[PDB]
Write a protein that binds this ligand. Structure first.
Ligand SMILES: COc1ccc(-c2noc(CSc3nnc(C)n3-c3ccc(OC)cc3)n2)cc1
Ligand SMILES: [Zn+2]
Length: 204
């Protein structure tokens, strides 16, 4: 099963993960409707997800992609936000749970911006917010997001909203255009870091 390795705040790895999360906050077109209003997060903890079977599947797929991408994985660290974090860390990403309504079809969506992933933690459009207060901008309830290793391989550049089931022939991912990073096989992502946090209320 899954083991969670507790990273200390004094560690460079904890600091690089938090720095990537904090520096990638952006203003979103919905004016904060989905994810809430904030300029920074309060990071509660950062844990490394260790699972032998999940690593094996990730390794297995990585090699196939590498063989088809002139010996390159084209790995990227990307954020993922969804109400399925707990299942993902135990069972792995699963394309049978791909977002069907996604702009680039039934895939698993990742982002360079942590604030983009925060919009999905409580559901599509932020759902009804946290279970306790029904608040999409809740400053109390703890949230979770993942900072993932994503095997992109040969990315297909998509500009039109198209409903793809799988990556196009000879490709391993879709970069849909801010860019949306999409994979269609759960084994092309490893949920490396589990980030537990709160959004913080800006000074009035
Ligand atoms: C029960 O066990 C499991 C095991 C695995 C998963 C899982 N694996 O990938 C995903 C992507 S969800 C996703 N990927 N991109 C988006 C966007 N969303 C998403 C986000 C929020 C949402 O809210 C209801 C639905 C889909 N979910 C789910 C459940
Ligand atoms: Zn709440």
């Amino acid at each position: 099963g899954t083991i969670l390795l507790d990273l200390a705040p004094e560690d460079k790895e904890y600091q690089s993960v938090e720095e990537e999360m904090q520096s990638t906050i952006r203003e979103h077109r919905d004016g904060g409707n989905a994810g809430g209003i904030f300029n920074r997060y309060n990071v509660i903890r950062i844990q490394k997800v260790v699972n032998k079977k999940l690593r094996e599947r990730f390794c297995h797929r990585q090699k196939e992609v590498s063989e088809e991408n002139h010996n390159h994985h084209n790995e990227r660290m990307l954020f993922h936000g969804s109400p399925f974090i707990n299942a993902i860390i135990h069972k792995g990403f699963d394309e049978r749970h791909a977002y069907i309504g996604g702009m680039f079809g039934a895939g698993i969506y990742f982002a360079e911006n942590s604030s983009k992933s925060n919009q999905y933690v409580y559901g599509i459009g932020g759902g009804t917010g946290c279970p306790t207060h029904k608040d999409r901008s809740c400053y109390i309830c703890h949230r979770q997001m993942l900072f993932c290793r994503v095997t992109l391989g040969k990315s297909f550049l998509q500009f039109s909203t198209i409903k793809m089931a799988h990556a196009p022939p000879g490709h391993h991912s879709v970069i849909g255009r801010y860019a949306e990073y999409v994979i269609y096989r759960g084994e092309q992502a490893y949920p490396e870091y589990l980030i537990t946090y709160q959004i913080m209320k800006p000074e009035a």
